[PDB]
DNA sequence: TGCGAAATTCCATGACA
DNA sequence: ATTGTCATGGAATTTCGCA
DNA sequence: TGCGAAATTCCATGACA
DNA sequence: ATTGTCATGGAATTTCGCA
């Protein structure tokens, strides 16, 4: 009223342009404007009119704008608008993103066998012998793999497929994701009890576990295609496809995963023998060559509109099973600390300290 | 002539019978003739099938040129030579009364006979849960002929468990004494 | 046996380099090169050998011949490979493809409202009044939706629905996917009764119902908002979510569904009034100079490794639902007609013709 | 004076009661003013209920200025003002037994009449599956002052079913002697 | 004839089972 | 016999208010 | 010192619930 | 407190066989 009331006299007001004719009608202060005439309402009804407009359909910054604009006009209008919207709570946890992750990482490979095993379940399969889930173990270093036949994606059942693997060797680290059988505290205490420090994927995040993931492709596509025209007995081809996939050649690396962990190929079809002439410590020295000056992939390029996590921002965490007709993000939550470009801790909405992948948050829109 | 090699050679034999564990009573022992490496698998009985079976698990992870053996029944079937057959793998027997390896070989499964005899004592029907333990100690033991224990031979690393302190690998005093009893 | 033999005597064969001295040995064929010595099998055994080292780990191309060339060589190698490779049936039907389909079609917005309706079924949603799913009803000019809640995605319930709607109106095409509820005869029957042409999508193609499929995001997400923190109760909102999407502003089309239906708005918030001094007549002749200036959009750039379908070319369709441990695409088939760059028809699997999206569809590799 | 426009005032009233068809005994009709554009919404009585159900219905498509009525007990509610109010529509009542619209509306109401007269008879019990076609005919009649129909005015384009053949919209003599027995 | 800022346009991102 | 679509909010671009 | 062709390398595509 | 991966087959590039 008071701003409205110098500007009906002629008295100039900072945001109001001055060549454009303030008058009163109705008992509205008005405006003409080039799109026609507009109302000016006073400051304290503007938030009401930006809430009512917003209200309708929920509508983003344009959307939301031109239906004030059809009646109304007053310096900054986006500006109100978007101090809405960065309030509504209902906006901000339903609507989607509009930018996307930062590149991702491509992690050292693991410097000698052992050093790193991933491992994972797949099922359920059809049943064979009895048989529903396969534990897979693929060490990182040489992508040697070990398929074990299991019941059930179990603690139990991991721990005593591992009491037979660990037979031949102990690794340093084992990654896994956060399922259930990996997660309790009785594997957590088989690994302590072994001198095995545990790894784990953050929450809903299959990419962190890629290295058997993609080993898992291999291991199905291969027994899809032995299946092929007869029934799913996958029970007995499991050694088969073990011993198959561990000489298969990769075509970046000109080596094969049994290449790659013993130095030389055993009795199997088409065994190489370049190092025939070779003594075994002869041998033992080119392979320690060979695993050092292996292929290592790069960070791809970022995306033109991709968003990296700084601390103290105001990110939101992707829901993990949302219902139907709820909302697909959780509240906003503040970044504590980055691990790396792809991974932060945030103070969760629940109150506690969460360590997630950038792939399961938005940053907050409208700060 | 070529230098030795792993897998060119498999030695294997049955240990037992020893006292029930778990349903087992044998153990089939695997060792490969250039690294020394050892694999135990525990059978039920020193037959065909349960070589077969044994070695099925073995043979997905690395199939050798020669498995050699005694003049052992499960051995020396027609069943047992069909199976190596079918895997290009090629049997070698010893004379009959006369069983023949190698020094290191040899030397090996005398380690092995040993180690189990010192932990089967006091836990007699338990040694099915430490045959991973048992492998790892014999894979991780120290060669004075090649200087290099079979995890390094066989895999060119160095292990995370290595294994500094040795078993005496003797009964001690008391042990002799529970033996007897047993 | 024959060319080898000319070969060891120092007689040229074409495809032998000259410069290598070919051997015998152990009773085999065998030359020096500069990898090692390798084995020459005589021309009647290479099949075999291509065969045997395929069928290791049904490999592809490198990873075939890396096994084979461990041991043997002889002329064009890897020409004998991509020959087995086109014949396996195993890795034909279960290997992926690498080739993107071809850029988007932006087909022309229909030219008058009720000129071509798009339909589809939303659901099944938690239940409200006894209802579970939501048939929505998208103008294809004006994008103005009609809802319809129902307990089934039926025929009944569309035609009951639809009876309604055609009150107003009716359209001259009724686009919609081949679910159960559109493709029954009664449904065919209704819309013959009424000089309505049904037109299909491809199967299994949902993008083709993109007007629709990009309504029911909208419908939901606002479903959603005004839910939050309340009973999943959606059977009252449907008539408030219409109307509210309606009216809601396109910012890139500057118009709400509305605006585009009726030429002015109704009594609704923030009505627009530019047009008030003007006639009906006069509003109805912007309204139709405002439809035909819509902004349309354009094929996107092809990507780096696309293909597209040509007549006679064996492509292969993917299966709908492939069950666990079985191949993901159909046997090759042979391309009859190509009715867009996105869309042909194919002698079917089961030597039917079947008019399919490319999306569905890979190109048999190695021809 | 602002020109007139559809959705400036909608014209409504009750027919009936007609004979129960499908468990439904009246029907509302709306008429815009601007347009004659006309929706047919079945009621199972004349009641404030069954009025704001139909009109929900019609204002989730389109809301108008002005809603029209004589002083019908199911207008003139403090419910049914509620309503109005709640959505910013204004009622305007014609004085009792003084009922006034426009020529356009007048004569559009008396076609509604007739039309449904002349297809009761034969069927008085299915005119509740006849509603559509009906409405599409009404809506796609041309109008001599205004030279456009209905359909014209309020989508501003041709229709996709275009009424050429007219209705007697007169009952033929074999309909008035079944409309007698009746 | 040019400046700073507001307003408009652009468009990559993601979801419709 | 058929075919993706478009709300969204930071960024890039254009226009506006003034001189 | 250069040519045609074979061989090798490159790398976008897609799937691991 | 953690992090994508790699077989695949046309295409692009390099190497080979010969002169
Ligand atoms: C995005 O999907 C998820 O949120 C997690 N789903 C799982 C997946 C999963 O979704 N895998 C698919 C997949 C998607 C993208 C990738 F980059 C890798 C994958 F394996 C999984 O592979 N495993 O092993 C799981 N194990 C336990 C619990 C969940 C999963
Ligand atoms: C790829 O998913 C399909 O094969 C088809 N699924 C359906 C989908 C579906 O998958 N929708 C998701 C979806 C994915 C990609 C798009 F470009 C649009 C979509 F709506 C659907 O929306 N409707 O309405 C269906 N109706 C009947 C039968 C199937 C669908
Ligand atoms: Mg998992
Ligand atoms: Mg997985
Ligand atoms: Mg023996
Ligand atoms: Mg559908
Ligand atoms: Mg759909
Ligand atoms: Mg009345
Ligand atoms: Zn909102
Ligand atoms: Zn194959």
């Not at chain 1, 690794?171 to 790894?199: N, Y």
Request: aromatic share 10%.
């Amino acid at each position: 009223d008071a701003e409205l009331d110098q500007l009906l006299q002629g008295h100039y007001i900072k945001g109001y342009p001055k060549q454009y004719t303030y008058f009163l009608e109705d008992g509205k202060v008005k405006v003409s404007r080039p799109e026609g005439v507009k109302i000016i309402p006073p400051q304290s009804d503007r938030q009401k009119i930006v809430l009512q407009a917003h209200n309708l359909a929920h509508t983003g910054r344009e959307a939301t704008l031109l239906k004030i604009a059809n009646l109304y006009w007053w310096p900054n209008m986006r500006k109100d608008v978007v101090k809405q919207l960065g309030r509504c709570q209902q906006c901000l946890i339903t609507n989607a993103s509009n930018k996307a992750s930062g590149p991702i990482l491509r992690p050292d490979r693991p410097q000698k066998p052992f050093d790193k095993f991933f491992i994972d379940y797949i099922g359920p399969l059809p049943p064979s012998q009895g048989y529903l889930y396969v534990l897979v173990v693929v060490d990182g270093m040489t992508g040697f793999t070990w398929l074990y036949p299991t019941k059930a994606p179990s603690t139990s059942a991991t721990v005593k497929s591992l009491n037979v693997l660990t037979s031949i060797a102990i690794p340093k680290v084992i990654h896994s994701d956060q399922g259930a059988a990996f997660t309790s505290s009785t594997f957590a205490e088989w690994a302590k009890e072994r001198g095995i420090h545990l790894e784990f994927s953050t929450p809903y995040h299959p990419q962190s576990s890629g290295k058997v993931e993609r080993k898992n492709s291999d291991i199905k596509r291969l027994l899809t295609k032995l299946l092929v025209g007869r029934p799913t007995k996958w029970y007995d081809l499991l050694p088969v496809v073990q011993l198959a996939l561990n000489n298969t050649y990769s075509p970046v690396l000109k080596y094969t995963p049994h290449q790659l962990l013993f130095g030389i190929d055993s009795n199997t079809p088409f065994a190489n023998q370049d190092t025939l002439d070779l003594t075994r410590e002869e041998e033992l020295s080119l392979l320690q060559e060979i695993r050092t000056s292996l292929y290592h992939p790069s960070t791809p390029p970022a995306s033109s509109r991709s968003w990296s996590p700084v601390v103290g921002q105001l990110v939101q965490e992707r829901v993990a099973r949302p219902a139907s007709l709820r909302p697909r993000w959780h509240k906003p939550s503040t970044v504590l600390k980055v691990l790396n470009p792809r991974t932060v801790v945030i103070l969760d909405h629940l109150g506690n300290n969460r360590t997630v992948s950038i792939d399961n948050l938005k940053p907050t829109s409208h700060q | 002539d070529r230098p030795q090699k792993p897998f060119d050679k498999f030695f294997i034999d049955y240990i037992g019978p020893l006292p029930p564990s778990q349903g087992y009573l044998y153990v089939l022992v695997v060792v490969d003739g250039m690294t020394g490496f050892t694999w135990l698998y525990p059978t039920k009985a020193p037959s065909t099938s349960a070589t077969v079976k044994s070695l099925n698990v073995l043979t997905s992870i690395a199939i050798p040129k020669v498995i050699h053996s005694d003049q052992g029944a499960a051995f020396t079937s027609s069943t047992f030579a069909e199976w190596a057959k079918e895997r290009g793998i090629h049997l070698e027997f010893s004379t009959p009364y006369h069983p023949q390896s190698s020094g290191k070989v040899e030397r090996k499964n005398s380690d092995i006979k040993r180690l189990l005899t010192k932990l089967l004592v006091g836990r007699p029907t338990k040694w099915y849960d430490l045959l991973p333990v048992v492998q790892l100690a014999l894979n991780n033991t120290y060669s004075p002929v090649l200087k290099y224990t079979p995890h390094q031979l066989l895999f060119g690393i160095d292990s995370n468990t290595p294994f500094a302190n040795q078993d005496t690998l003797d009964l001690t005093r008391e042990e002799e004494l529970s033996l007897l009893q047993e």
